[model samples]
Target: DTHTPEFLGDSSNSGLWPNGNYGEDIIIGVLDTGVWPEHPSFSDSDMSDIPSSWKGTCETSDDFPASSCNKKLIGARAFSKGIDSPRDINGHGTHTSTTAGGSKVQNASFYGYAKGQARGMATKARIAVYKVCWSAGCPDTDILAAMNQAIEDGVHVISMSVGPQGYSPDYYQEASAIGAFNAVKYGIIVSCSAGNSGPKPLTAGNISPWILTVGASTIDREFRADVVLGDGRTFKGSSLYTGEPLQDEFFPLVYAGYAGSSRFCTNGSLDSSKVQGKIVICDNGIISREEKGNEVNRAGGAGMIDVTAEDFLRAGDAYLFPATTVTLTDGYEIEYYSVTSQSPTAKIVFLGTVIGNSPPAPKVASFSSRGPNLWTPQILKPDVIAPGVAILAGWSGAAHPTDLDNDDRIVQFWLDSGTSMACPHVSGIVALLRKAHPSWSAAAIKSALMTTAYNLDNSGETITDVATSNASTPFDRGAGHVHPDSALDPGLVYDSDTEDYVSFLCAIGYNSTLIGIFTGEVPPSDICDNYKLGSPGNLNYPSFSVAFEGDTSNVTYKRTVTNVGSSSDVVYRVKVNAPPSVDVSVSPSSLVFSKENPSLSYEITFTSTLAQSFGSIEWSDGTHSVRSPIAIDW
Candidate 1:
């Protein structure tokens, strides 16, 4: 949790809650599998008393009692069927929960890797548990129920990593959409994972602009398990293999294709005679990693080298054999050596941990859902990215690292890789923003983060996809990676209210009763309740998207920004990097702010270029960068 704090620049004395005043009594209601109060990260050391605003109560079951919930973990209301307690049998809930607001735990690591002092992003925020997801997957029925309970409980931030169905045209059709609408209407910031279906366009979930959709990106941390060749050559590989390391000597290497009947290592394919006592090279295919190692072990191989896919940025894997996984390039290099050289040999070297990897990070994970916002193309999705790959956080004692029941190894923390992991990072950051700016609306908090998100990696270049090594578009990482410190003092925010969301709904053809489905029991109102159905882009959202129709060239959008900077009377100049072949124009290119007029409006026109174009627009006052990404289609 906190190697990330240092990695994310929170190591400074001015870092987030550095004085140990974490999250200011904020309650982050995590709706997932459940929570593991037994994990050291859930200890209430230095935690304050439960907030008076909390209305949720700790639930007691045969396996768990109310006493399991403490000051740090203030509430545990279970929603999983037959899983009565708020304890996590599955590790997913605990990892995400602790990622948001776990207490400081010393030397927390997974399988003795990433070992160090670990704590959540907002270490003192109260975590309320709503165990909605169970064994296989999270049910929408339970998710709806969990959201209602969280809203009723008055939780400030709802960090749910569950919602994602390929967007239905009617927002009310999706339970989480309706739930998020109500949560936002009731002053709750709902952060959701963008889903793990990606490297594909239009796969993003939690696409509703009302929901803060978080995408996954990588941190600079690396778990080293380099492969050394017999000829004093070395190639970088990574692993979480915790078993004893091989002796410091080279072992003969053979490609799985040469040693086995199949290149992909299918079961019952390997010829044990050729593979015995050698390091075998295998490709990560449809068969599980456990099976891959089992196959190699059954063949009496000393160790294995795994070849991961081109976009595989994940590194938290516990191998069944003495092994390490290398990138496609490195794997290919080893494969070539085995095939080309005589008696090619290699040895696995397990180096514990290292940070600050070059090529740098903040790169978009290939798995984090991407978007063109299929349902509402005018609304950008995956509001921003955060460190999600190889994230080390709390784990449940009842579950193994992989949550495989047959596996007996237990630990206090696990390394997670998903948009689910990314969601809570923002949740924790949003909780602090909520604390520091008590009057800020949920939309304002979103704007603060989105507008101030950074597009460059640590190396000062555009953030790229780990897949292609190409710069990520706005769809891949909305505004950019979250810059927590920059967000706290964002000079301007494009804020919205409940009624404005109504306009957004009305623009998309949602009527009163359907809207009532989200608002729960609000009065039936018609035609946006006298609200104008502006373009979907006119939701006072922090970012802008323009999808032009055939024969459509120019489209205009109006955005209103509120001056939330420390001082009034600030000026901002508009800068545009219009999509290639598109002409972008903003009226009154300079904005002036003052106490008398805290909010100002500007109209920007997008003259479309062609298909699949992306760029950004920024308003900089030489200090705060109120940047918004632009996506266009023709």
Candidate 2:
């Protein structure tokens, strides 16, 4: 799958977030560095155009002005000091903020992957970007402080595109865990990136029993993907610009290979390169992709493309800049051309392919961190996966390597790739699902995502391979790719609120005095508050991790939903599908609607009836789903 437009489609994304009406009156918080408020996508969504007060802190006031980012960004807020309000110092905040609630910019190039203009999942939702990370990135203390702030601010959903390298890292395992546990108890949904470092198995990070972990993917399979042969020709990539002819040497010849790293790397190994007039193709492993792009540019290469070898079956390639990375299937296409197209040639026919997909679900992105979270072996690393690879996104300041260019437009507006890109996707989807079910608790949101997800390889089969590693395996992917449609049908959910988690901390063997000393709280939300927290174990468990019955078999874990809203017509449906190893049967399958005391209920059991040792099940309501693997032999 070449990253070509034709392969990916002019409308690579159509109706993904139909109407962009993601639950209003709902406030989601992104506790990251901070968001650049001037970006178009976010700047444009001015509630000022509507009315004042109706728009709370979530709405952009004179203090936090609106941004065109709304066509791509929802809103922003800053929690860090010095920078009062959501002003991004580190580019990460803006990138993460927009990824989560960036509005839909109609007909913009969006990036080379998707077509028919770019759009975020929750275009209409409000964002409160909490400036957490600094320019060089935040330390562990800053992240925890921001998490705590998210609770105090009364923000519903919080996303973090920031985290350390290893889940085993002391900072993440300890401090972050405390903050994440608190977030869950408070009924606020927390999400983080799975990290970008792999080709190896058993990798995952920022993993906790409470937060939603995410992965990335490319739209390589979309019809928009292009494989333009080397000729003095060019095809259009983004709609932002009118149709332009192919450029000479546009698909410059660049060698594709793996390189070692320099000092500024996590793994001490980098994806390096060489060549001035050519493009460099390297494997997507080690270090941040931004670093990889900088390396190729530093080498004087014309462009950069990083292929993913790890999770080749699950995770797809992450696209940063206008670079292109071919998947195994797409790689075969280029290999054939390199050998045959250059034969005695009238100037070797070059190719620049566009990769995208409609649903855009790929196996694990090689850059997506692997899992078996060192801190908590009971929980899977990435709780979910959304559009992260080649995702058309917004930048914070200016395109990097330009060094001193400070123009916010040129600097702040652009696209990138990583688990950073994927985390917001899930957040935005949450906004949309919340829009559909305003009363759904934070736990319900998590349950819908996990229970309604589907697990499969690029070939769309329920099989295991190097790329996918068996959909149920928590090492490569958690739950499964998000299915917004199925999320609507999840019968039951794991509900949570800010206070609910606080009580959970008390329940999970924490004394009120101890929790107050660390979390600065006095007694948290009740476990049985309007928002419910449910699992096989105690309802007040503070951890996001859960152990279902089918430890050795794939099975479906069901949760019921009840309309908590009063004086409103609440309607809903129930749907369920599971992996081969598990069979799902629901009693009183349909929801009973009512104008008075409307409550929906259902029960589901996850069993490894299909395959004994392969205890795991990929189940969903055709929208929200989870891959619950029965591995403990319960």
Candidate 3:
């Protein structure tokens, strides 16, 4: 087998599985290429183990020629351009399915291991595979059909590594509307890939409130910066010289860039001048892996390299350099290389590529699609970004190289990157949390994921500024990369129920009157009035934004969760930041939070004890803030 497994064993790596009652009640639906049941990973996990009560007849044990099936491989369906049932012609579904809920394996070459072979994060949970993307990319209309079908199937979680069409927040295509809204409406957990475009900004998709968009990172948690040495062997780092001898740095390194898909990088005539005599550098921006190498040859450059720009330490195997890759920690040894010779005429030899781990958690992938989406500005795109880079997983025989049946016996192992990679990590975590708190609503799940999530990395600094970055809004990254354990108590999840969102749609001015009309019933004026809030276009709800004002600027902030715990537990806390001018204080400082309680209000009485020379007021959450632009003369 060409591929090995990434998630193995009943350990922390596999969604931090809660040690007790197995996830027998949970069900996850994967929309991709179909899975191969013959794989050994399912030998012990059979179909009879699944609850016979499942309702959807879209797939069944009797549908296949095989005598038996695996419960972990619970169910499957085909939804393609031509049909409604999903089947894997390409095996992409098989790969995603195994990773999401396959059995585990443990070994060193398996990346890292506590077990020997293939394993899944949701090892105990069952799955429903929905084959969508074929060898060619999936069409928008087909995507919509598959998404609707997944919802109708009554699956608990929906995982689609696919994403929006482009980078612009203004680009609101049909696919985004269908997939994103369905996830939101049903309270199901949705996971998608953060496009492979990285080491730059605005490369991935900008999505809606319910969906969790993922980005890529390496395992060792560092960028891969390849430094082509004078001979052929490659090292790592960003350099002006491709480790080649220089006549005082032979020539100035010429640079050229490409966005989207263009052949310039791959064509041999990349720019002869740069590759032949000078050095070249470029990001893993918008071209293919082969193209990055070709671009240097075109420029007539001696060699090339790349960078993740910011702290690539967050991603393992982070940077994308030409030839070979080096870690940021030791990259400088090659990057700042000047001529010093034990033997002169240093010859940089370009060796084969080296794929490795990348930067740590909560670090931003520059390419994740930005937001303030033009079509649905009211709805948050890329609701969240999870760990999605060089992720180890059960390899499906769907890639370009494998579709030819070069090695049909073994399942391939891969360390895939992108938001597609990050999504399932979060999805699995959500499953774990949901299983722990079976009573939690989808809104509560969203709230937990949003509120309890950690804002800082291990270093305690905020990862990236959302508004300042292309992935707009705190909602875009959604409280930062999910801290699965910490997500248990996400403070204030911006929760919404179907009814609440219906009201929100009513508030946003959707066709509330028309909703009733669908059933051939009369409509009320209040329902019609709801549609008047705005246009009947891309109306989704529970949108969020952060506001700033005085006093709140320096205040250390926090939120306390309640009302949706296991029982009637009342909890709340207080945080304060005092502005320099007015003397203001929050009476009682802290308020009570109750679970399943009728009282949904928190009372905070702010008093201005003294009017000072200057004054300003900002609420703790920063949503309501007022400032005296000039000195106040009271």
Candidate 4:
């Protein structure tokens, strides 16, 4: 609960808390590797019966049994050509499913790391797993087959932790994109991973607006491993080695470069003769820390220290050998000691765990992908950011923590990082929202989530990026970090239905035949022509991204908002925090909504006077604040 204070605190006050009202009838369809159905987290002790809406079936085999499907876990299916069952050999699916809606587990931890009362976001919501990936990779064909099954299974939400290896194909050709579009048309919300290729702009793999793409952020709790050098200088590092600590005495340290090896400690690069019984220092880049440690151990090294060129932001990982990750400054200091001193030595002491608000939580994780939306530059890609860095969630007992062959340590829960973990966090929240407002459309729910998200962190400061140590913008964190409490009661939602999405396809220059293939509907002959003449920017998205060009002095966006609050008689006034060089104006500044007329239309005109700028425009009533970020590039 402490790891997700913003979500827990907000959700508790809104009566959507997981303790009692745990999203009982909502079903979340997860399309991933598969689930470890035998795990205790899927136990249906508290569930009375399976949801009536579940029309799916469990395909059991020698590995996965029919008894695995219970009231809480109502469905299971697979699309693997090689694998025979939906049983999870790869732990990714189990972790994501439990993160979304698994049963609560006491004393859950990743081998004494992150030990606490672990539970899912929607504890009572049912899970339906659809295995679509295998050892080879998740083929597009298998993914589409799983999507077809999930949509037919009558799920309230679909969580997809899969994405393209590189840039995505056209929407009509993309299986996940087309599947998500059809799912939303049936009132199902789809949550997808934004991608893990971080700190790089235009690298987002999931750019479809119909899908809720989630990025990664950080929490307050962290594992600390201090590195004490022979010179008595201590530097902060991180690790998850729970084995016996090394002796208090300092061991001789040798840089991997000086030990006749590549600094990455790749296989066969490190010589066993020179590195035996010494602490090997390796750089963090291409190789995994666990792999580097294994390489050092194979080379007869006592310990390994992996250092990076970034600040002291370390994502903790467990290794077979005693290892610690340090910042670049500490790496250089160790290098100086190795050059100047007669013999350099160091010792690593595990600091257990520390919890506080030191760095101000919710910074965009360094590995969380950034975006200008490579394919659809006009629309923002990542709809929102969530807690993903070193998140503690369910793990399959079949795989080791390091996923190595020799390591056999088994744990029911694990700590992992990536947009994959972030995707499930939003998926679970969507489950809660679906239960709260059963009549709401998928786009309405998405708009509530995006507009109610926070752009600031726990310390009341603008969100920061862990990689650059600078304030984040809409591009880094679209909309902002998700706050589920505010989302539950977003006064106004910028909702869009199937027609608007079809028009979006038309505006993007997709022909009628391509649109028909994508949406399963034959669009009118003049649909493309109409959208080409009209503005593509008027898609009723929660946020706005205007790319300025030559002779582009002013750009206007037309938006419609539905009053979703209890008091439809309330009036909302427009508030604009315009960018430094952009002049923003909202026509019909005040909207008087009533139960008879719950929808209102407004126009925003942006006139740029400088090169680039970013800001927000909020619709505020006395009770609620519905905010949307605006990004402009010239």
Candidate 5:
């Protein structure tokens, strides 16, 4: 319990658990690959019963039986191009489902790794699987259909690890965004992945504020493997190889460049005779790292070592052979040693799991996408970050740990890393919040999670990115790392309703006719007539960003907050960290909330003094810190 979840403020000290059944009556709909119905994590042993509000069905076939639906897993549906089965031949669906709400399993481990009691954040909640993604790809039609079906089925929270590709599309053209808007309209929270293209700007694929887009981060646990050079120098690396370890004695070392030009150990590139009984070293590029190891094994090499760039070496990787991945600095040292030594030799050693990492937990994963929202510059993306690197969770026996065909090993648990893995962590937390505060709107819940997040690591240092070892900004981690325990008591929330979203659509250039399609109502005389439309920056979001093309300019944004604290008459004061080269001012500098006046509106004015700036604003009532980041460009 003090591992991944504890780092996210989900422990007994936060008063989040050991009080009552937190998520007993909630149901989470997982829209991704189907699930492995036979996995033990879906057992209904301790479940009180399925939620009576669930109105879904289990699509049965020869591969998936109807009996697979139990009190814990109440429903299943699949939407493939031609296949009708909902059973997950691929393991992605089962892995995410179990990570969200699977029951506690004792003695659960991944190939003797992360061995312990494994349970989800909301272990008592039920799950409903929607198989919208197939081997071909998740089509827009299938995704929208599944979203509609899940909404009709009465799911309280919908979690989809799938997202858009390339550039972010307009809300009308994007099936996921459109479906998510409808879900939010019906009071259901939607969570999605922020894609896996990272360490680069404008790569965030999801920009809709109505959906909770999650990025990836690393936890404190690591699988430590080492490379011992002939000179007695040891370099740290990461691997998940459970096979027999190489002997202590060093073996002949050979570089891929000496054997071939590809430098990636492509098939037939290395001469079999020269590589045999030697530890082959290859540079990382062009193809899968696992394939590089397989090529070494095919050449009868004793072991393998990979030299990957700094960005590619952040997340721990698993190998199909006795191999380790070294950082660029260490890779250079190993190469120099191999050339300078009389008998170039090296050995790979496997050390078991290491816990309590000192630097700090939650370095933003290198592969987690970045924001500056090229598609919608005003709205910051990747709402928050969660543990996704080398996460231990349930796996489907249908696929190997490396996801390669030749490896036939089967297991109930495995380690994975991606924004896909990060999405479910937030989904599980949403289930807890949904049950704890049943009256909170979807926007209100999102606001609570974002405003109360943590911006520092356990060492009391600013959070940094795994790729560069530099302090990260909102572009890399959005609001910050989520703190679930503090979120449960966010005194004030930035809540919105369906009409507010419609007004936002109008401001974004959507015509009344187009707005009608999303609102599911007849075209109004004028969609903007019901409410005064604001600019794209005026969405009442948890974070604010204004991009300017010229040298200087002034911008204004409007926001409203609802008081939900115990004190009906609470006064909050404004605190602003104005961005460099800019003068930020807030109108109605203070807010007074009472039972008769639960909501209040305020305006923020930003006056630029230079080309660019960044800062934050906070509303403090002496107990709660509702903070929001502010970014500007010129």
Candidate 6:
């Protein structure tokens, strides 16, 4: 509760206790590496019986017994390929499953870190898991098969973190994009990871307008590890070291660069002679953070300090040995101290886990994928970001917390990062919304989430990117960071239906046959004839992105939003935060909605100088605020 809802503050003042029956009967279908059915997070002790609307099954195997699943874990299935079981061996599925709709567990922590009453986003929601990925990669046909089954499984919400190969993934071919289209048509909301290839340009996957693509943001808690030099200076770092601390006496500090031809401390790069008893400093690179610690332990190092570059912000890794990670800037000073001093020594103090951020929470994680979406430049992607770093959730007991071949530590709950975790956060929130407004379309729920997201930068006006701790664009954070509290009662929603999405395919230049796959049926001939004239930018998305190719002085779009608030007899006035190089105007400066009519259309005209700029459009009534982010580029 403190993680997802309570942290965001009071969402609704309904008559329910401790919040409404959180997604009571809502079923969330998760397509992942499978789920650990016997985990405490999936216990059904306090949950109500499974809903009758659920038309799913519990596929059992040697590891996953039929009795493993209960009312909470209503369903489990596997494509039967790699492992051939609906059991999570890696803990990824369990972690994500718990984040979405796990039963609240008391006194939860990851090996004495992040201790608290850990609860899931939708405490009462039912979970249905589908094992799609295996070994290391997901078979293409497997994801497609699971989607086909999940669509007809009576689930209200679908969560996926799987992605296909290639940068510009063709939507017509990918399983997620193709199937999510049909799922929405069945009144199911799908949530997908925006990908972990981030702080980069055009790397965000899961770009479909119908799917809720979530990016990663940091939470307030962190694993506290401080590096104290004998010179009376200390540097802040992070770690999950649970073993005995090194002797209180400071150990000789040495930089790994001196022992290797390359400084990254790659395998066999560190000379054991020099690293044997010293605290080795390793520079971060393409290699994984845990691997650096692995190399250090292999070479008999007393401890390891993995320094990260600007693009790599936080590291809360559970390593085999005593180790922690510091930023490049902080590590450089440590490097300088070791090199300049006659006898430099350092001692690491494990401060356990900490809450409250000196830098605050909700910063766009450095590794969270960015956009300008390579394929769909017209549609703003990464619909929103959620708590990304140090997310404390369920983990598999059979697998090591780090999943490393070397480390053997086991923990039931773990602190993890990436858009993979972020995906489940939205999936769970959608579960909550679906329960609250059972009649609202899935698109309306998605719109409420996107428009209610917050993008307030701590230091500046725009949201900050952890990579550089600088101002980021809407391209980085679509509508912005997700605030589930505000999303519950969003006044207006930019809802779209199957017809609009089909029209979107038409606008994107999809021929009839290519569009057929999205609907799983033959599209009407000359279907594109009517909607092809429309721009993909007019897909009724909550956010807008305009790519000025030639003449930017004249470009326009009309948007229609359904009033989902308390009363349809409400008025909303228009407000625009025009970019420095653009002039934006709303045709109907104000909206006058009536009880009989729930939707209101408004036209926005943009006059730009063919340059890159960002802004927003807000429809505000006395009670609620409907916000939309706008990105303009050539």
TM-score of each: 0.95, 0.64, 0.65, 0.94, 0.95, 0.93
lDDT of each: 0.83, 0.51, 0.46, 0.83, 0.82, 0.81
**Candidate 1 per-residue C-alpha lDDT over 1-634 given as tens digits, one digit per residue, 9 for 90 to 100:** 8587766666436845643256868889999989877778888876568868789898887788777888888889877553457788888899999999888888787767888888788887889989887766677778888888899999999998886644434477776787888887767999989988888888888877888999999988888889999878898888888777778888999999998887777777889999999999998787866567778887888998989876353687687568888888888889999999987989888887778757588899988889888789899987999989988898878776553334578888888799999999999888878887888889999999899899988888899997678988988999999988778788899988878887787888777877677666664566575777578887788888988885457888999989988888899999998888688999979998888989999999988545678888999996888899998877
Q: Select the stronger candidate by lDDT from 2 and 3.
A: 2
Kindly list the per-residue Cα lDDT of model 3 for residues 389-453, writing each as its tens digit.
44456654434312222223333454444566666666666666667676666656655664544
Candidate 6 per-residue lDDT, tens place, 1-634, comes to 2355555553336512133367787888889889877778888886777767677898877778989888989888888553368888888888888888888788888777777767777778889998897876877678878887887788888889777443647788778888788888789998999888878878888888888988888766667788999899998888887677777668999898876555788888888888888999999895877888888888888998888875344656776688888878889999999888999999888887666646666688888888878887889887998876778888877887664677788787888887888888888888888887889898999998888888874433667888776777887788998777788788999988988988888888888899988877897878787664377887788988888766556578889988888786999998999976888989899988888788888889888754578899999999788999999887
lDDT of 5 by residue, 460-497 (tens): 77689987788888888888888888888889999987
Kindly report which residue stretches of model 4 are placed more than 4 angstroms away from their true locations once superposed.
5-14, 18-20, 81-83, 258-278, 285-287, 295-301, 309-312, 403-405, 522-524, 527-533
* lDDT assessment of candidate 6: 0.81
Per-residue accuracy of model 4 over 1-634 as CA lDDT, tens digit each: 2255343453454455642267788899999989988787788886787756678999987788878898888999989754478888888898899888878888887767777766678878899999998989898888888887899999999999999765566677778888888888789999999888888887787678899989889888778887899888998888888677777668898889888559899888898898999989998877778888888988899998888768756556687788888888988898678657897899888776677787788889888878778877778878899888887887777888875666788878878888898898889889998988989999999998899899888799999999888899888899998888778889999998877888888888887888887767787777676554255678989999888885347999999999988886999999999987888999989999998889999999989776547899999999899899998878
Q: lDDT by residue for model 2 over 1-634, one digit each (tens)?
A: 1121222121225423442254344456787766666665564444434223223244455556654334223344444442255665456666667666665565554323333434445655667666666655566666676677667766667777777664346322345567777766556777778788764544566665567878765444332223354643322111111122224444454434323343222232344343554555455466554456556655665554444443232222233333444454444444444445552111212232234433334556656777655543444566766666555555655345124222122433444568888888787777766666655666777777776666664567642323444443545556666766656555445454555444444444445555664455564544224333333233321112333444454333343354433323544443444434455565555555466545454455545453112235332332333334433223
- TM-score: which is higher, 2 or 6? 6
- In model 2, the worst 10-residue window by lDDT is 1-10
- Badly placed stretches (over 4 Å) of model 6 are 1-5, 10-20, 80-83, 257-277, 285-301, 309-312, 403-406, 457-461, 530-533
Runs off by more than 4 Å, candidate 5 = 12-14, 18-20, 81-83, 259-262, 403-405
Could you give me the TM-score of model 2 versus the true structure? 0.64
lDDT of 1 at 577: 89
